[PDB]
């Protein structure tokens, strides 16, 4: 019973950063599509910093490659300034740091830290550490949240059901009950008829390629937006003075590193508690419908001054590619469109490791065995049918920890090599019993074949009058 | 629950038919004929009987371009793009349709019992009094003083299309013609469209009024709204896109009408409409046209009184938020992507009645007054 419109108010995400597009922007780059494209064996990408990158090297300009969804947007558009989505840390962990610096240290203990006369060093040093507490911390931050491989196995479960591709497909046709409907938030598992996942497919070409990221790109988003909102809705204040006085305790140590991915390193180290981490990924990562996504795409575009009906509009779009071709504030969404790119390319969205090694029903022999006996079940002995329901909770239930090679891309079945574990069914275990439910249902079939239509014999004699040999 | 999300139970219902060949869209030369001047009045009712035939085809005058849906030149790229893109063969039309219980009493009462699955304890007893259409050939030609089985025919042909389209569309005018639910439309259309007099409201009080938003008058007070970017495009798409808001909100004002009636029904509403629909066979079997059956099938069942508790609280404040979420849900059903460049659903809709099918003249009538609406505000 709901009486209320359709739309609610939500605190969690309502948060943006204003900041001019990119000159390289995706659009801008004709041949960005060649470059994002990736093959067999390519390694996670990794998040940068400002000592390997010196300067940012760079509103639509109609190229010559821009493909057709491209080409009509590049034309019919008012682009002054494109909204992004607000990517950051919560405002009072940011306080802490910020009040902290606030120049508070001084240059005094600067030069004795460096043990040389030379002011320069002094400036670098401060440089250093501006931008690590600007960039580079949240960059170390998302690279531990998002880098876990078991965190990482729980993306590629999502997105292999949102998209409704691979074991999750075979599993919804054989059980005859859907499965995809299955929407959550927060671990509440609920469940929705009215959701669309599989409008995708009409699309093909280099409009699916694109299309994806953007839906993967927002997807960790969401993501990392709800995270940062019920970590911040569960702050401490008293937490706050414990983080000043280790902050004080350790701002000796903190001035004295050489690499500013290493002051970045520690800096999360301390701020970052391992069991919060641990805590927000116990069942944070929920499912999401494509309408959903779309809904917080459209949300994204009004907001940002933009008409959804102005022909086509992605917010992936508007957003650079390379670390050294982004100003260091969109550094963060730079590594999230490469994060997003190598999900999506690893999950095979264009199955991934999730689906070739063992639920593989083509390539695992005892689990299409298995199938084959799932209905032509039966035990009494005063139900014991082996239902399509237990079969497919079993096999959606299972997953090998090993043969998951969440460090590069694989693609078992393309590699000359065996699985690292044997093949095994998920209900049935005995290969003894298996073989024996093969043969009744053998011999129950060429029985069914031999006398199927019943057999006229003759009356005085005993032959048979239409004999099929 | 999910934020981002949607579940609701009286507003998708979503009656899905095949694109009528001659829709919005197959006509190029449809802005000529939507051209309004000052002396144009509201768009009238329309019978089967009134329009001599249907007919569905592009016809004359439409030549394909040199290149379900046929490109054509003399129209907005958009539909070009359109048209190039998507070409499906059915789409989910909002469902306008009277509430299932009223029409299904109507039925079994006046046109004919709804028959039973056959519970298997015997057979060939030929109890047809069960599954008799409720008034018999015998009764009808005393009635009709005629014993030509075409006119049977013909009348019974007659009030089964008026008791399936036009007693549905009549309660629509009555619905949409008053006087002071025609100032209320402009005023909360001048409200969503943030024109004239509410920005002058808006200057006086210093508060913007796009954060005022109401349902069935419990007003929820939705603060993340904006309403000023369609003045930044001008011409034709300017007017294609109005005239869909105004008919996508005149379809959800119809939609949550419809639901509140579904709403409040009880079984002894049920036994009054049968007793009155039993004690009146006669008048209604027995008419004139079209027209006068249709009117008095609504006083029957659309009681003034009803008419009149309805329409208070009936338009409720709506952004143009909520109208795109709305579209984004009828295309996305529909089976269309929504990243397809410039898709609406007013495209899918024939301009006037004599090319519609029968089962869409009240997506028809919503589109024209529609129109009427939004070149009488001034739109500019």
């Known amino acids: 019973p709901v009486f209320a419109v359709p739309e609610v108010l939500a605190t969690y995400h309502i948060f943006f950063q204003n900041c001019k597009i990119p000159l390289s922007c995706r659009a801008n780059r004709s041949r960005a599509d060649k470059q994002l494209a990736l093959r067999q064996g390519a390694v996670i990408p990794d998040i940068a910093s400002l000592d390997e990158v010196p300067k940012i090297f760079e509103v639509l300009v109609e190229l010559e490659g821009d493909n057709a969804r491209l080409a009509v947007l590049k034309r019919s558009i008012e682009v002054t300034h494109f909204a992004y989505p607000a990517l950051n840390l919560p405002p009072k962990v940011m306080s802490t740091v910020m009040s902290e610096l606030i120049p508070a240290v001084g240059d005094e203990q600067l030069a004795r830290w460096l043990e040389t006369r030379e002011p320069a060093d002094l400036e670098e040093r401060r440089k250093l550490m501006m931008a690590a507490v600007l960039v580079t911390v949240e960059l170390e931050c998302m690279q531990r949240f998002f880098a876990d491989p078991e965190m990482q196995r729980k993306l590629e479960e999502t997105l292999h059901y949102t998209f409704r591709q691979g074991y999750v497909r075979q599993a919804c046709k054989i059980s005859n009950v859907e499965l995809c409907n299955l929407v959550s938030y927060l671990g509440i598992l609920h469940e929705n008829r009215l959701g669309q996942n599989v409008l995708h497919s009409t699309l093909k070409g280099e409009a699916r390629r694109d299309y994806v990221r953007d839906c993967v790109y927002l997807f960790l988003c969401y993501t990392w937006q709800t995270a940062m909102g019920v970590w911040q809705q569960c702050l401490e204040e008293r937490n706050l003075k414990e ?108 199955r991934c490791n999730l689906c070739t090694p063992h639920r593989s029903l083509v390539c695992n022999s005892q689990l299409l065995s298995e199938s084959q006996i799932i209905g032509t079940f039966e035990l009494q002995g005063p139900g014991l049918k082996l239902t399509p329901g237990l079969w497919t909770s079993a096999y959606l239930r299972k997953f090998v920890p090993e043969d998951y090679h969440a460090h590069e891309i694989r693609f078992y079945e393309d590699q000359s090599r065996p699985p690292n574990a044997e093949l095994t069914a998920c209900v049935i275990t005995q290969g003894h019993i298996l073989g024996q439910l093969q043969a009744i249902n053998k011999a129950r079939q060429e029985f069914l074949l031999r006398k199927g239509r019943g057999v006229y014999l003759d009356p005085q004699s005993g032959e048979e009058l239409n004999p099929i040999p």
Not at 300 to 316: D, K, N, V
Not at 332 to 350: E, F, K, R, T, V
Request: aromatic share 12%; proline share 7%.
């Open 243 to 350: 983080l000043q006085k280790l902050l004080k305790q350790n701002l000796k140590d903190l001035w004295t590193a050489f690499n500013e991915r290493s002051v970045a390193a520690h800096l999360a180290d301390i701020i970052f508690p391992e069991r919060l981490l641990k805590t927000l990924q116990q069942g944070l990562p929920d499912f999401t419908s494509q309408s959903m996504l779309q809904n917080f795409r459209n949300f994204i575009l009004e907001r940002s001054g933009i008409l959804p009906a102005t022909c086509c509009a992605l917010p992936s779009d508007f957003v650079p590619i390379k670390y050294r071709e982004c100003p260091p504030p969109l550094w963060g969404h730079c590594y999230l469109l490469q994060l997003a790119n190598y999900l999506a390319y690893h999950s095979d969205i264009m």
